[PDB]
Design a binder for these strands. Structure first.
Ligand SMILES: [Mg+2]
Ligand SMILES: [Mg+2]
Lengths: 41, 53, 237, 285, 127, 41, 42, 163
RNA sequence: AUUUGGACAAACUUGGUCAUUUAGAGGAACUAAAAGAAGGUUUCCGUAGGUGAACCUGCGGAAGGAUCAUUAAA
RNA sequence: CCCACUCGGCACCUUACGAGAAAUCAAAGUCUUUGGGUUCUGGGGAGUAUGGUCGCAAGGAACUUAAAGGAAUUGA
């Protein structure tokens, strides 16, 4: 794990709010990877 | 998962009861003389535990 | 920790049974303030009923904010201690016992870049009431001042302290406590200190921080009644 | 399915030696007679035990870590010396140890001082013992009267035994390197044991070594020391604060030790002080 | 028609005391602590224990006749920390929720003009 | 790997364990322990 | 040594137990027995 | 320290006192002379109970253990462990065979004196048990909670085996 | 108080005799046995100590040790 | 209190047409190599061995089969 050393953009309410509501970004890369592979193929 | 205001020699910590105690320990270690790098490592350890629970 | 896992203690062996509710035997009593204050009603207190009740009442001290007694928020930061001296038909006649400020107000005035001047005097009233007064003052910067700070030389501090002690000593000696308390409420003492010490050095937040009552003479019920401004019984049949 | 019991005693949660020369030396200086049963503390993997097992009638290896115990077992199973090794597991301060003639120990430094006195008080104690301590603790055992490190440990251990330095072991020889330097020593418990009560000797030494470089008289000026010695005297009479004060003064003056410092006193000086107090009826413990 | 008490809250590091008494302070009306309301030592200072203690006191006060209270919160003070901890803050919130009218809130922590040495030693404490 | 350690200890016979009380008990958990009359008769 | 031997020898004359003596460590602190078995049997 | 319990032997020849100073002393009843001192527990003794048939003594401590003493040797025969909290009462049932104990954990444990194993655990209380009385060699057992709840236990081994 | 004699008689020691459990070592039977990662630690100076010392501790001192936010007022 | 000036002080910021390899220095500068007066001083971290010096204690009885002479809920 990596720990952020910069000021968090999310206010303390937001972090609690977000956790109230494996990774979307990771799946975002997966879709792009498939698109890049398909175009290259 | 807290917020800290360092007003001169006066420290205020905002957060949940368990969270502010965790922040207080790290701050106190720094006051007692622990170098920041060593405190940063322990923060990573507790930060990992916080996610699994 | 009332859990079962908590280790047993020796003291748990024999415990008195709770068989009497204490408030069954308590009796309520009403506290009244001197005539120097606008609001006489300052609440009520309770004591075990006489088997006497008066003995526990006498010497009891209650501290209350001046804002309640004067009905104005301007005294929110000042507290007055009143001591029970006489009891008459559940009415507790109280007398002035001391004065003090709230801690939050004291911390507010103390600030950096200025000098703190505090003076104290032990002095007695004309009623032979020995009391100790504490005064506090702070330097201030003039209207056109450009320096960040407004420190005063120790010569100015010693000069100001001497003036303050003279004023505190003068007023207390030439006044009764009932008169002295009458002076505290409008804060005329502070304004007098301002004008006298002003030519020495400009000042701000001049206040009488605290008042203590070191000694008391022989209690006088006649004087106490006059300060508060007898009654036949009813035939029981 | 022994996990039920072994887990009830251990949780299954060290600096290992890496110089063969010291290990061979410790065995060599032991001079194990063939008819000697040896007690081996901190057997570790078994590097030192196997050398001892070759020369000894029987070897009792005392261990605290269950994991290392298996390592010792696997190294000795199906060998001529398997029948002469008794591996014991667990904390060994509390138990009554068997009889042993020689003790070779790579002791955990935490249990150094309990171990040194367990061997001393062991009924029929061993004749020679090669123990591995840290430099500071070892030097205090080896400290002589008048030295900077002379202390209660030096005086107590030197009357029940004789401690002599063997070797210094550096922090490089151990991995991971410890922050303190090591050394080997030999302890020779005296036989017959000196016929002085252990409590009486330690009782006197504790009072006078509160401030070792301070005069002996000042040690007896303490009110608590005055109080306890008074109660001890009352117990002696049963089988007076001013009286005990005078009694202490006469003993210190006559023995000519009241102006001396415990850091510069020998066994004789303490013995003379102990005797004079007994004549006057003050029994320390 | 409004009888006033004094709610004295002592918020220590290891416990919280909620103590309601008359205006004089000589007569105790109800004293409840976090330890009485929790099963483990570690949780005595917790805000959860403080709220249960405050609610229990408020129920007792209404029975006796007290309908309003003046809050006088304090910390350990002396040579130790001077600000009431989260335990004291939780008790204050619980009293407000209980329905008792809060008259005046003041911090009366014992603050020394000058103090004796602290327990830590030269190198500090509170690891 | 701890279970492998435990089985090795139980496999061996020259091993004794100390409980917190200091008692001498074998791996299985039972207290580990000649008379002229018994051997002759 | 001979001085040591004499002193220890004389200590033998003045020797006692230490169970009751306060340790110096405190300085820092400052019918038949089974008649019941008969009645039930009968 | 404070004396917690007193027990009298079957023949009234000796009686034992349990104190919170971690010791039990056995006194000769006729003269009051100290027959022996039993000092093995680590916390103060809450109760001491003579065995009513042979020369045994059970002492209950705050160290969560109960120990059976042989009077003839005045030594600890068996030590019983398993209570989560201090053991407040201990009495013999079924003559020499078994021992029943109560603790602050609210659990009543029936032990086997010979083997020192917990045969049964009766859990009908939610608080510490100060009082425990037995009748007819433990055929009837009554335990009182600190809350004020009585549990009148009746032996039913003979009944269960018949079923 | 104390003495003689006559019965009742607790308790003690002793060899036997019946009943009850009960400890090791043997011998010889019967029954049962459906599982399958990493993870505590500032560097020293002077002085004083150390018996659960892989190092600890008391007093005074040093940086040769990583400064974010708010902040003139109105 | 404000402004301007002037002595002495704790300090600070920007720069050196100077110095230094550099960190940096109003001195650690005195226009290429050198003299205003005067006091003192000089010519790191790990190991190896010793024809050297000085020091440092106490005390008055082995033997088993080497070994299936075994393990085994797992075997023959
Ligand atoms: Mg803490
Ligand atoms: Mg040092």
């Amino acid at each position: 794990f990596e720990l952020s050393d910069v000021k968090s953009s999310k206010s303390l309410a937001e972090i609690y709010e977000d956790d109230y509501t494996l990774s979307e970004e990771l799946q975002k890369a997966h879709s792009e990877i498939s698109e890049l592979y398909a175009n290259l193929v | 998962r807290t917020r800290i205001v360092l007003a001169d020699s006066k420290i205020h910590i905002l957060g949940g009861f368990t969270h502010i105690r965790m922040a207080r320990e790290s701050v106190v270690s720094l006051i007692l003389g622990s170098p920041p790098g060593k405190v940063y490592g322990n923060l990573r350890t507790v930060a990992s535990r916080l996610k699994e629970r | 920790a009332v859990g079962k896992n908590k280790r047993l203690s020796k003291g748990k062996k024999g415990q008195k049974k709770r068989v009497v509710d204490p408030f069954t035997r308590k009796e309520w009593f009403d506290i009244k303030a001197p005539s120097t204050f606008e609001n006489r009603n300052v609440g009520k207190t309770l004591v075990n009923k006489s088997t006497s009740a008066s003995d526990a009442l006498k010497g009891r001290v209650v501290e209350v904010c001046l804002a309640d007694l004067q009905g104005s928020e301007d005294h929110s930061f000042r507290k007055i201690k009143l001591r029970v001296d006489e009891v008459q038909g559940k009415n507790l006649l109280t007398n002035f016992h001391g004065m003090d400020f709230t801690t939050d107000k004291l911390r507010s005035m103390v600030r950096k870049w200025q000098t703190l001047i505090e003076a104290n005097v032990t002095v007695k009233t004309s009623d032979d009431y020995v009391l100790r007064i504490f005064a506090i003052a702070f330097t201030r910067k003039q209207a056109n001042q450009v320096k960040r700070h407004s420190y005063a030389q120790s010569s100015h501090i010693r000069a100001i302290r001497k003036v303050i002690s003279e004023i505190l000593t003068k007023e207390v000696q030439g006044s009764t406590l009932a008169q002295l308390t009458s002076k505290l409420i409008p804060e005329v003492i502070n304004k007098e200190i301002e004008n006298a010490t002003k030519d020495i050095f400009p000042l701000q937040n001049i206040h009488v921080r605290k008042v203590k009552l070191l000694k008391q003479p022989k209690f006088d019920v006649g004087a106490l009644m006059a300060l508060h401004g007898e009654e036949k019984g009813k035939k029981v049949t | 399915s022994a996990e039920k019991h072994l887990s009830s005693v251990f949780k299954f949660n060290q600096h290992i030696l890496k110089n063969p020369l010291v290990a061979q030396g410790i065995v060599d200086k032991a001079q194990i007679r063939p008819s000697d049963v040896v007690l081996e503390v901190g057997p570790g993997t078994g590097n030192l035990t196997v050398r001892i097992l070759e020369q000894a009638k029987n070897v009792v290896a005392v261990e605290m870590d269950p994991r290392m115990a298996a390592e010792l077992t696997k190294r000795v199973r199906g060998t001529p010396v398997e029948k002469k090794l008794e591996i014991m597991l667990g904390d060994f301060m509390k138990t009554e140890l068997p009889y042993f003639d020689i003790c070779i120990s790579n002791t955990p430094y935490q249990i150094s001082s309990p171990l040194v006195f367990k061997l001393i008080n062991q009924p029929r104690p061993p004749r020679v013992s090669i123990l591995m301590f840290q430099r500071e603790f070892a030097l205090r055992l080896l400290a002589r009267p008048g030295d900077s490190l002379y202390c209660r440990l030096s005086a107590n251990v030197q009357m029940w035994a004789n401690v002599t330095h063997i070797m210094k072991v550096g922090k490089n020889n151990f991995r991971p390197p410890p922050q303190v330097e090591s050394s080997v020593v030999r302890l020779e418990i005296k036989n017959p044991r000196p016929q002085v009560d252990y409590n009486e000797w330690d009782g006197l030494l504790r009072i006078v070594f509160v401030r070792k470089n301070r005069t002996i008289s000042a040690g007896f000026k303490s009110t608590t020391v005055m109080d306890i010695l008074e109660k001890n005297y009352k117990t002696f009479l049963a089988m007076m604060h001013d009286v005990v004060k005078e009694k202490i003064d006469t003993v210190l003056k006559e023995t000519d030790l009241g102006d001396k410092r415990a850091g510069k006193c020998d066994q004789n000086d303490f013995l003379r002080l102990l005797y004079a107090f007994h004549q006057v009826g003050i029994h320390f413990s | 028609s409004q009888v006033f008490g004094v709610a004295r809250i002592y918020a220590s590091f290891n416990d919280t005391f909620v103590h309601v008494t008359d205006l004089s302070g000589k007569e105790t009306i109800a004293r409840v602590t976090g330890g009485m309301k929790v099963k483990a030592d570690r949780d005595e200072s917790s805000p959860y224990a403080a709220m249960l203690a405050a609610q229990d006191v408020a129920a007792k006060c209404k029975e006796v006749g007290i309908t309003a209270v003046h809050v006088k919160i304090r910390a350990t003070g002396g040579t130790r920390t001077k600000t009431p901890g989260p335990g004291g803050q939780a008790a204050l919130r619980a009293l407000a929720r209980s329905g008792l009218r809060i008259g005046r809130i003041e911090d009366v922590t014992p603050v020394p003009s000058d103090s004796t040495r602290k327990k830590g030693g030269r190198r500090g404490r509170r690891l | 790997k701890r279970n492998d350690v435990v089985d090795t200890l139980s496999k061996a016979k020259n091993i004794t364990v100390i409980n917190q009380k200091g008692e001498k008990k074998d791996v299985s958990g039972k207290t580990k322990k000649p008379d002229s009359t018994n051997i002759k008769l | 040594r001979e001085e040591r031997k004499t002193i220890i020898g004389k200590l033998q004359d003045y020797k006692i137990d230490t169970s009751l003596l306060t340790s110096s460590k405190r300085l820092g602190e400052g019918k038949k027995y089974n008649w019941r078995q008969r009645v039930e049997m009968e | 320290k404070d004396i917690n319990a007193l027990s009298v032997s079957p023949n009234d020849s000796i009686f034992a006192t349990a104190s919170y100073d971690k010791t039990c002393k056995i006194w000769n009843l006729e003269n009051g002379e100290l027959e022996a001192t039993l000092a093995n527990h680590k916390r103060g003794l809450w109760d001491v109970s003579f065995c009513q048939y042979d020369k045994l003594l059970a002492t209950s401590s705050g160290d969560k253990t109960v120990k059976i003493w042989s009077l003839d040797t005045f030594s600890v025969m068996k030590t019983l462990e398993g209570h989560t909290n201090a053991v407040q009462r201990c009495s013999f049932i079924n003559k020499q065979k078994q021992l029943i104990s109560c603790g602050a954990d609210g659990l009543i444990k029936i032990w086997d004196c010979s083997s020192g194993e917990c045969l049964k655990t009766l859990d009908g209380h939610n608080n510490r048990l100060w009082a425990l009385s037995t009748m007819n060699d433990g055929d009837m057992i009554v335990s009182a909670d600190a809350d004020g709840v009585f549990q009148f236990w009746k032996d039913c081994t003979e009944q269960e085996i018949e079923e």
